[PDB]
Ligand binder design. Structure first.
Ligand SMILES: O=C(O)[C@H](O)c1ccccc1
Length: 113
């Protein structure tokens, strides 16, 4: 399937133990996609002071369309040193590895895979 319904645990930035997916745009997009497949991906909602507490390159989920079965359609966009790889809509948050942190909420998304 081209899209997969996922429920992403929303984590507080100060709880996150592993603050990015790796060291290159290509690696972080690869690792994000793997963690989204394996159910080991969390979402941090972006506000003032969040991104400097996480590791670049960043992986964002961004709205790809204006929401089947409650699931917002999203795609992945990476960022390194102020350059974005991908073009998409509003940021829903930044993806990180999930290693057992307790979430504050779930974000229902339909991920373009
Ligand atoms: O196809 C799968 O195994 C799975 O749906 C999946 C989820 C997220 C990204 C890629 C693939």
């Amino acid at each position: 399937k081209t899209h997969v319904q996922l429920s992403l645990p929303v984590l507080q930035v100060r709880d996150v133990l592993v603050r990015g997916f790796g060291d290159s745009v290509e690696e972080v997009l690869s690792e994000a996609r793997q963690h989204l497949k394996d159910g080991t991906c969390g979402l941090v909602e972006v506000e003032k002071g969040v991104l400097p507490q996480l590791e670049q390159p960043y992986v964002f989920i961004k709205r790809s369309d204006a929401a089947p079965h409650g699931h917002v359609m999203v795609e992945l966009v990476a960022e390194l040193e102020g350059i974005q790889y991908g073009r998409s809509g509003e940021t829903l948050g930044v993806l990180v590895p999930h290693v057992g942190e307790i979430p504050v909420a779930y974000r229902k998304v339909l991920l373009r895979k």
